[PDB]
């Protein structure tokens, strides 16, 4: 008999930073609108789909 | 005069089908139909 709230699990976007494969391959990886200490946390636990 | 509208970025399986295996396989069955929506936004988004 308590009030829990319900929020997204952790709706954003990929995006992905990248120079010409031409000229190299490195690539640098965006997290769209979301606090990447979670991200961080949640590489950890292998939940990132 | 206005210059800009908000930015938006919405996104087909996400929006249609919240967390839905069958629900988005019914939808790849829809063909490439809302890949023209993500790429119209992201024409939108570049605009402004
Ligand atoms: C998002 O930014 C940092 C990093 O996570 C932290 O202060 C908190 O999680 C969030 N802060 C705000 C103001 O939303």
Same mark, same amino acid.
């Given at each position: 008999?308590?009030?829990?709230?319900?929020?997204?699990?952790?709706?954003?976007? $990929?995006? /992905?930073?990248?120079? @010409?494969? !031409?000229?190299?391959?490195? $690539?640098? /990886?965006?997290?769209? @609108?979301? !606090?990447?200490?979670?991200?961080?946390?949640?590489?950890?636990?292998?939940?990132?789909? | 005069?206005?210059?800009?509208?908000?930015?938006?970025?919405?996104?087909?399986?996400?929006?249609?089908?919240?967390?839905?295996?069958?629900?988005?396989?019914?939808?790849?069955?829809?063909?490439?139909?809302?890949?023209?929506?993500?790429?119209?936004?992201?024409?939108?988004?570049?605009?402004?």
């Amino acid at each position: 008999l308590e009030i829990l709230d319900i929020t997204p699990c952790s709706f954003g976007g $990929v995006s /992905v930073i990248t120079p @010409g494969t !031409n000229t190299s391959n490195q $690539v640098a /990886v965006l997290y769209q @609108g979301v !606090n990447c200490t979670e991200v961080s946390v949640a590489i950890h636990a292998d939940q990132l789909t | 005069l206005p210059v800009s509208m908000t930015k938006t970025s919405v996104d087909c399986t996400m929006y249609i089908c919240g967390d839905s295996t069958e629900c988005s396989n019914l939808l790849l069955q829809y063909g490439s139909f809302c890949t023209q929506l993500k790429r119209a936004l992201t024409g939108i988004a570049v605009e402004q």
